[PDB]
Amino acid sequence: EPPLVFEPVTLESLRQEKGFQEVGKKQIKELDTLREKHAKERTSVQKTQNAAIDKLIKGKSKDDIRNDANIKNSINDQTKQWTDMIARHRKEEWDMLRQHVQDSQDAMKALMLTVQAAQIKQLEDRHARDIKDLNAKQAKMSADTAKEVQNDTLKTKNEKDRRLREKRQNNVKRFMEEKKQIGVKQGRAMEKLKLAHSKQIEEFSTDVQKL
């Protein structure tokens, strides 16, 4: 029997024993299993992190867009409100203007009737002066005829008195014819006056009714 020879025990040879390698293998799995506790958590923690925020943003987005909805809902109300106000404000003008016109119309028509009447009275008032005036002239002659006879070449009152009686009555004829004429022109003047007023009314009425 050859003498025993013993391998040296080395870090290498010990390292390679399969019993000792079984220690390593156990250890790695223990670390795989640790990585398996971390990956689960790592992933799941990010899952909570993401889940909360992703819905957290949605909650805010729900209100945020809602707030926009409340401006359109308000402004759209606020704009019509303006339209309601202008529409009736627009009436206010139309309502008022109609009275302006009606009253302006009314006033013009009143103004007409007055002036028309003012002309009538101006004529009437004149017409009466003419007759007094005339009366005077007629009276003045009556003296003038009478005074002349007294200074006339008639020698005797018998003849003097006969001629004034002739003259006076002749003059009374003239006084009456004079009166007939002024009666007539005055009547003619008046009618023509009232006919102008009448037509003015007719034309004024047609002229307004147009507008």
Author numbering: 23 to 174, 176 to 234
From the primary publication:
At the inner surface of fly photoreceptor rhabdomeric membranes, the master scaffold protein INAD (encoded by inaD for inactivation no after potential D and contains 5 PDZ domains arranged in tandem) forms stoichiometric multi-molecular complexes with phospholipase Cβ (NORPA), Ca2+-permeable transient receptor potential (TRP) channel and eye-specific protein kinase C (eye-PKC). In this study, we show that the PDZ45 tandem of INAD functions as a supramodule binding to the entire C-terminal coiled-coil domain and PDZ-binding motif of NORPA (CC-PBM) with an unexpectedly high affinity. Our biochemical and structural studies demonstrate that INADL PDZ89 forms a supramodule and binds to the entire C-terminal coiled-coil domain of PLCβ4 in a manner that is strikingly similar to that of the INAD–NORPA complex.
We reasoned that this packing surface might overlap with the INAD PDZ45 binding surface, and therefore prevented the same surface from being used for crystal packing in the PDZ45–NORPA CC-PBM complex. We noted that the solvent-exposed face of the α2 helix is lined with eight Lys residues, which are all evolutionarily conserved and required for the membrane binding of NORPA CC (and see below for more details). The evolutionarily conserved, positively charged residues in the α2 helix of the NORPA CC are aligned on a flat and exposed surface of the domain.
